[model samples]
Target: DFENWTVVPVETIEGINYYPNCLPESVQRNLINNVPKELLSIYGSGKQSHAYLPFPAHINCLNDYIPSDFKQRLWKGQDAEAIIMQVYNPGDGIIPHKDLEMFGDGVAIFSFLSNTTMIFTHPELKLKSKIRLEKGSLLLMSGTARYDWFHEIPFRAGDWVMNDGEEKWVSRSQRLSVTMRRII
Candidate 1:
């Protein structure tokens, strides 16, 4: 059964697809409320920003959690084996790095609570791309974008962006991300 919602096609990089508003505000709020306390507590009770590296637990075989259409589109029409959730406060960000080699292609992340800019760079080649991840957006890092490029969420209180053809800074708040990964 398909429930219709407009998935805004924002932009694309090599093998990277960025779709904003894939999930509505209600859906995003629901997921945010249901996020396990085990994950949420970490950010609240911790000091420094947590990197994806400490290897957080991935909730397995939870197809019922995410809307099916998202699975179909981002996962290439398959079930996502592992779902990981992490929370971030303002001034929190991750450095440039590829995901663990243990994960296969099609690394999907859903953003909630706030907006931030994610920077992508080729480790060796002189190539760079910056993508703004608005709340309730989905980002798919697959193929070349997954393997060849390193992605980063730089530390900052806000991001400089173009608003109505004018450059400006948009302040940020707490952000929570749900990451879906398939093991190799």
Candidate 2:
């Protein structure tokens, strides 16, 4: 049986990778409750707060929680140079936009605290898709996913998705996201 492994480079718009339950609850709790928070005052849109840290400096504890293979497996041997932690209260979200070019090829996000939808849009193709960001899951965007597509969490109360045998508009809740990027 394929007890399986971490993320895979997928064709979901090409180079978009998603891993559900990738980080265990213990790791989720540690990052959610333990990592220090800071205000990203003049950084970007949305007043949502986040903290930035150099990978080896403050967030080294990730070495203890995440299996050693992840650094080699998920990141392909290169360590994350920066981590951006964000907090999203119910209905708080940013406008659709491609991430900063300075961040390079791949960007990974770890979702904690709550599960929510992340919307991806393509300008030229005029297409859009929504992927739920489950707590304890990780979303890795690379190649086209890192460049051609623009991503965002809609500014709304909640999202309509399948649950309990039906699709319903589930109300939003607080969400914590730790985004990792390899700086060039």
Each candidate: RMSD: 9.2, 8.0
In candidate 1, position 116 carries an lDDT of: 90
lDDT of 1 by residue, 129-179 (tens): 788888888787877888888889988878999988899888878788878
Q: Residues 41-90, candidate 2: write the lDDT tens digits.
A: 32333244434454433355543433345456546676676776777777
The TM-score measured for candidate 2 stands at 0.77
Q: What overall lDDT goes with each candidate model?
A: 0.69, 0.69
What overall lDDT, based on C-alpha atoms, would model 2 receive against the true structure?
0.69
- Residue 27 deviation, candidate 2, in Å? 1.2
Clash pairs of candidate 2? none
Q: TM-scores for all candidates?
A: 0.75, 0.77
